[model samples]
Target chain A: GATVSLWETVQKWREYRRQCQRSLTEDPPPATDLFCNRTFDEYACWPDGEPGSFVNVSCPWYLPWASSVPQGHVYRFCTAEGLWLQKDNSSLPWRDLSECEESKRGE
Target chain B: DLSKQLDEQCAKLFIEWLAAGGPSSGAPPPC
Candidate 1:
């Protein structure tokens, strides 16, 4: 089922990580390219992605007034090198969740 | 009360994720 709360998504991410870790030694060999691993970025859950990919996820329900308004999509980018885009080489990856903002729109 | 609970859980998970080096950490055990 789709997630309705931020904590729910985080728990899902934790479970997903556990499974991945449980069998990493037996996993198939990677492709010639690379993969940007799946993650929950405190606000949204994103799936694993290949190089040069763009992914979008629905807004998080925990946002204030989110239940009463139309939800938008947030975006994250995977680089050609299979890395999640980062800001100024920061350890944290960059994501475009402005579309999910509750403010900024004059509605 | 319910909102506070959610916040606490989310924050705890986030810290755990960061300690594991997150997605950019390389490999699944820490993913």
Candidate 2:
């Protein structure tokens, strides 16, 4: 099932890192209080999923590319508080950390 | 045949934007 596959993707991506997480509610401080406590790093995510379906992920910033990941393909993360922020009036952005992109019609 | 993503219009746009400022007009290497 897609759910199983998606869950597996998260597992693979999670172990993909050599770094670390918590829930940085947006990073500024006790005031804005939404900043980074992790090292200089990156993370992975699958933007395509059922609505209301969110998967928590953790990966290192300097991880070597996974064979599952497309070659030379950069994924996404939330170094800036704004990145993981909820929508305002506009739409949110996406990242390809998960191998969620479907393969084209033929190999 | 490959199935289109359930809702990729926005996803597609996001992908393009991430890669928009790459060396050319393609996805940039992993950051």
Candidate 3:
């Protein structure tokens, strides 16, 4: 089991993105509404989602605790009105990175 | 352009990636 570098992880993500785009082109949706816009929020790339949904993504390798944590994940909450939940202080969407840390988990 | 944005393709692919332990795994396969 070899370790994966941050760059390697990013490359994998890029490939994933390409696949997603290709799939979309091949089979476009008939109707789209009440969904949040996709975003790459510095830490992770979250796919578009419907309102009241939660999208979970793996933690970035840059975090010290990411590797040790067996299931390191973070989530983005899509608000009820089809928008990414925003932080109180800023207009930018909020990502729940708190769970990425080992200490944050219920121990 | 009837409504908001939605990328079901990414959502489906992402679920597969997560199931395969994408970035978190030591040696991740194609996900």
Candidate 4:
């Protein structure tokens, strides 16, 4: 039933959390307040009201200095600019910053 | 052939080490 799937997902989530915590520990940030504020937590939630599987619900607390743009268009525009501006690493990965185009290229 | 045998032995040893304390090691026996 839901028990097996939920257990597996929760185990993976725990692994992800452990990896993130270990990385943070090894590379301690310069600003403790900023690092503390930028944390997230995962919760099990059934968005569709079904019972067989649990979805990970990440609650990110802090907004980086560059998350100020409109949501959908941000990634698209940033990728287009990256194609024209950088031309080397043109393909944008997930969560690429759109508003930092000028600073991205240092031009 | 000797290096291959050594590699295989090392791999087995590593797996056994992980199986002893890895995430899927299952709950420990109660005292």
Clashes of each: 0, 9, 0, 0
Q: What fraction of the native alpha-carbon contacts across the interface, defined at 8 angstroms, is recovered by model 4?
A: 0.00
- Chain B TM-score against the true chain B, each candidate: 0.59, 0.39, 0.49, 0.57
Cα-based lDDT for every prediction: 0.60, 0.35, 0.57, 0.30
Worst 10-residue lDDT window for candidate 4 chain A reads A41-50
Residue pair clashes in candidate 3 = none
lDDT tens readout by residue for model 4, B1-31: 5654554344334323322433434434211
For model 3, the docking class works out as incorrect
Candidates in order, TM-scores: namely 0.50, 0.24, 0.49, 0.24
Better of 1 and 3 by lDDT: 1
Top of the candidates by TM-score? 1
- The lowest-lDDT stretch of 10 consecutive residues in candidate 3 chain A is A1-10
Every model's Cα RMSD, please?
Answer: 8.1, 14.0, 14.6, 20.3
Identify the candidate with maximal lDDT.
1
lDDT of 4 by residue, A1-107 (tens): 21223234334546655666665456544442211122222211111111222122222111111133223121211222222122446332223223322123332
DockQ of each: 0.12, 0.04, 0.03, 0.02
- Please state the error at residue A15 of candidate 4 in Å: 0.2
* Runs with alpha carbons beyond 4 Å of true place in candidate 2: A1-7, A16-69, A75-100, B1-31
Model 4 vs truth, CA RMSD: 20.3
By DockQ, the best candidate is 1
Q: After best superposition, candidate 3 residue A58: deviation in angstroms?
A: 1.7
